[PDB]
Amino acid sequence: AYPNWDKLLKKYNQGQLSIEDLLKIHSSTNERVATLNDFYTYVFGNIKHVSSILDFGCGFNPLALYQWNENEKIIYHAYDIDRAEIAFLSSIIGKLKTTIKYRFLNKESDVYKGTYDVVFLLKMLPVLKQQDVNILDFLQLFHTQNFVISFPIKSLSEKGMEENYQLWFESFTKGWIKILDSKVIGNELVYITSGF
Numbered sequence: 697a698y699p700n701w702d703k704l705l706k707k708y709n710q711g712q713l714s715i716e717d718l719l720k721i722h723s724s725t726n727e728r729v730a731t732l733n734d735f736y737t738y739v740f741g742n743i744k745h746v747s748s749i750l751d752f753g754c755g756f757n758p759l760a761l762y763q764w765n766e767n768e769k770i771i772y773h774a775y776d777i778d779r780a781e782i783a784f785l786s787s788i789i790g791k792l793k794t795t796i797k798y799r800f801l802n803k804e805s806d807v808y809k810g811t812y813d814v815v816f817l818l819k820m821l822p823v824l825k826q827q828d829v830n831i832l833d834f835l836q837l838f839h840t841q842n843f844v845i846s847f848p849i850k851s852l853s854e855k856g857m858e859e860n861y862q863l864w865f866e867s868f869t870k871g872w873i874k875i876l877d878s879k880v881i882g883n884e885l886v887y888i889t890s891g892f
């Protein structure tokens with residue numbers, strides 16, 4: 697069920713909910729918890745010095761980054777179409793102490809105007825494709841040097857629904873962006889690419 701943000705915030709403020717509990721709320725972040733350290737170790741290990749990040753369609757990742765981070769110096773810009781979810785996250789993170797500088801964006805038009813060392817599109821391409829977004833044109837909107845593009849790895853166990861994201865992605869990006877590396881991190885296929 698869609699979360700009751702106001703109620704969740706009250707429970708949290710009362711100590712009835714932990715960050716661990718919160719990370720389980722959004723399935724995309726819940727699925728990443730088991731490999732949280734491996735995910736970020738992989739990303740920052742393959743992308744030399746990130747000072748700025750744009751997390752497009754961020755979900756609860758802002759919270760996951762807080763959980764994983766120790767002392768990174770990064771300006772993290774978070775954007776998601778769900779405004780209420782962003783408001784909730786901003787209220788929680790505003791209560792926390794962290795070296796990462798959070799910037800919650802609410803205007804889509806502002807998103808594409810920034811300059812970011814890297815742009816996160818975690819479990820996003822399928823969603824956008826579904827919304828009939830021209831993915832290539834979309835990717836060209838970002839003034840970034842690298843992308844972190846990931847896809848969920850679904851259970852192998854229906855009819856008429858292909859979804860071979862790996863084949864699709866490595867196929868349509870041919871000659872536009874260069875794939876620097878890719879790896880299966882838990883239930884997620886993560887791609888590290890160049891720009892445009």
Ligand SMILES: C[S@@+](CC[C@H](N)C(=O)[O-])C[C@H]1O[C@@H](n2cnc3c(N)ncnc32)[C@H](O)[C@@H]1O
Pocket residue numbers: 724725752753754755756757775776777778817818819820823827
């Ligand atoms: C599969 S979830 C991925 C969440 C997060 N990126 C992660 O991997 O943990 C899809 C996310 O994209 C957001 N979203 C859907 N359509 C969007 C759009 N047109 N623009 C920005 N965000 C969108 C949803 O609210 C949701 O949080």
